[PDB]
Structure formats: structure tokens, C-alpha cells
Design a protein around this ligand. Sequence first.
Ligand SMILES: Nc1ncnc2c1ncn2[C@@H]1O[C@H](COP(=O)(O)OP(=O)(O)O)[C@@H](O)[C@H]1O
Length: 229
Amino acid sequence: GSIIEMRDVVKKYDNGTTALRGVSVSVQPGEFAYIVGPSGAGKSTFIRSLYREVKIDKGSLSVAGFNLVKIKKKDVPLLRRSVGVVFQDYKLLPKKTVYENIAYAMEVIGENRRNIKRRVMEVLDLVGLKHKVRSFPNELSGGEQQRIAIARAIVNNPKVLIADEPTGNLDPDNSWEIMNLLERINLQGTTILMATHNSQIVNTLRHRVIAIENGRVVRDESKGEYGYD
Ligand SMILES: Nc1ncnc2c1ncn2[C@@H]1O[C@H](COP(=O)(O)OP(=O)(O)O)[C@@H](O)[C@H]1O
């Protein structure tokens, strides 16, 4: 079945503003989708709802098998275990080695010695930074920081990866590197939802395009174009 199912989802903030006005999106496993649209359209409310940070007021929403309306807050961490989140403002722990930044998310859930150092070296190979396993974050470039952040978000192998403007703070070439890493992640099966306003990326790296405008899905196309300024 669908890994993300959103039907007639309404999100009203307490100040009367309605960020989502009955949005319906169906995402199969392994899909790679861009979330585009003018600012204030509700892109980030859309994605924030996908890991239960935002609670919807009306409609149905299920992510990775979890009914997000009925999920108990005590279970949201279990939801996050299947739903990794990458941010614009990549922020690693500064007094921790690259290895420790990645290993923390596995130590939390109590993974044993064996799987931790194996899994950390694996994801370090994926992001191509195993040669900096013992470096701290600020000897790392910006693009390298976002790559380690992405490694952290996928260390527990989540089924879904929500990326809010992953390249928003990176120059063109480092953004291509982030997109290539996201692509290889997607090819391994991870469903990737990427909110973005980089039209070059969207138009060269053709994937599904979900365009939101004034809280409503205005466009949902295979290998679509960016379609904005
Ligand atoms: N915490 C909040 N309280 C009230 N209104 C909010 C809140 N967060 C966002 N909004 C409003 O919801 C709408 C969508 O915002 P947002 O989801 O951040 O849009 P986008 O990500 O497309 O820029 C805007 O009108 C914004 O002002």
C-alpha cells in the first residue's frame, strides 16, 4: 500500500490562519517527490505534519503505517525511527566526532556494539566521508556538514526521509552532491520528500512534483517542472 496517505487534511493555526485546506497526497514506497510552491503556501506545514510535529485538525493522515491523528505522543519517537528529517540549518554536535554524531541515534535505541560501528562505517561510505570518521564538525565544509547530517538522519534506515530545503544553504556544486546522495538513498528504497525552491535541481533532476498554493495541492506530476519564479 501507500507509505504516505493524506486525505482532505486541514490544518488551522490558532490565529485563524488555515495553512492546509483539504490536501490529499498519495505516496508509494520508494517515491522521490519535490514539494514546491510560493512561500507561505504551506510547504513546511505539509512536511512537518508528516512526522507528527504538526497535528492535523481534519482529514486522515498515515505515514509508515502510523495513523498520525490517533498516534499517541508516547509513540512519536517510534514514528521518527521510520521517518528521518533533514533540515536547511544543518547542525551537528560540535564537541563530538563525525562518528559520534552518527552513532548517537543508534545508541539511543540501544543498538549493540556490532551493528553500530558497522552501520556507521556503512553510511559514512555512502556519504563518501569515511576518511573523516574522527574529525569534528567544524573542520568540515558546509556541504560535508549537510552530508553528515543526512547520514545521521538515515543511520537507522528510515522508510521515509523528509528533507526541508536540503540545499538551501549550499552553493550549486555542493547542492548537486547533496542531490546525488539523496538519489542514491532513494534508489536504496527510501521514500524521499523534499521541499525545495531550487528550480535548477527540480528541472534537471526530474522527479514527482507536488506544487502547493494557498494551502491546496495545485499540481502533482510525474517528472514535472518547477514552474515558478
Ligand atoms: N506556528 C504558526 N502559527 C500560525 N500560523 C502559522 C504558523 N506556522 C505557519 N503559519 C502560517 O501558515 C501558512 C503556511 O506557512 P508555512 O507552512 O511555513 O509555508 P511555506 O513553508 O510554504 O513557506 C502561512 O500563512 C504562515 O504564516
